[PDB]
Amino acid sequence: KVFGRCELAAAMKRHGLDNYRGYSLGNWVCAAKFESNFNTQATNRNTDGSTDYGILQINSRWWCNDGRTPGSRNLCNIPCSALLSSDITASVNCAKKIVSDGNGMNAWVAWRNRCKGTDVQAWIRGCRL
Ligand SMILES: [Cl-]
Ligand SMILES: [Cl-]
Ligand SMILES: [Cl-]
Ligand SMILES: [Cl-]
Ligand SMILES: [Cl-]
Ligand SMILES: [Cl-]
Ligand SMILES: [Cl-]
Ligand code: NA
Ligand SMILES: [Xe]
Ligand SMILES: [Xe]
């Protein structure tokens, strides 16, 4: 599923991401925009052989199990496929673990490079919510 911006904002809000660990909803929407272009099915292979999954591009090195990332953990206790669902619950739940992990949203390289420090509220501007 490719979310619309406002539709994703709504979904993220519903799932308790707005201001989760202090990160306003625009941060999450922005991160999702640049991580996946709001596409729940987004996948990207990393050079280390791990893969990033879903609307927030959660990595199999730590967070999910894909059966093909040797020595990996599965800290969200989920198959990485769960992260590709049109329903964002698993992505959100895993994102919450990630962002609690100590480096906050810097875990998401696109957030750090494209969202951090920017007018992230623009991403939820005009949305009803
Ligand atoms: Cl957009
Ligand atoms: Cl915001
Ligand atoms: Cl991540
Ligand atoms: Cl497996
Ligand atoms: Cl694995
Ligand atoms: Cl684990
Ligand atoms: Cl933080
Ligand atoms: Na893993
Ligand atoms: Xe991929
Ligand atoms: Xe998400």
UniProtKB/Swiss-Prot annotation:
It catalyses: Hydrolysis of (1->4)-beta-linkages between N-acetylmuramic acid and N-acetyl-D-glucosamine residues in a peptidoglycan and between N-acetyl-D-glucosamine residues in chitodextrins. Lysozyme C is capable of both hydrolysis and transglycosylation; it also shows a slight esterase activity. It acts rapidly on both peptide-substituted and unsubstituted peptidoglycan, and slowly on chitin oligosaccharides. It comes from the Eukaryota. Lysozymes have primarily a bacteriolytic function; those in tissues and body fluids are associated with the monocyte-macrophage system and enhance the activity of immunoagents. Has bacteriolytic activity against M.luteus. This is Lysozyme C. Gene3D superfamilies: 1.10.530.10. Monomer. SUPFAM superfamilies: Lysozyme-like. Belongs to the glycosyl hydrolase 22 family. GO terms for cellular component: cytoplasm; endoplasmic reticulum; extracellular space. The gene is LYZ. Substrate binds at D101. In the egg white and polymorphonuclear leukocytes. It is an enzyme of class 3 (hydrolase). GO terms for molecular function: beta-N-acetylglucosaminidase activity; identical protein binding; lysozyme activity. GO terms for biological process: cell wall macromolecule catabolic process; defense response to bacterium; defense response to Gram-negative bacterium; defense response to Gram-positive bacterium; killing of cells of another organism.
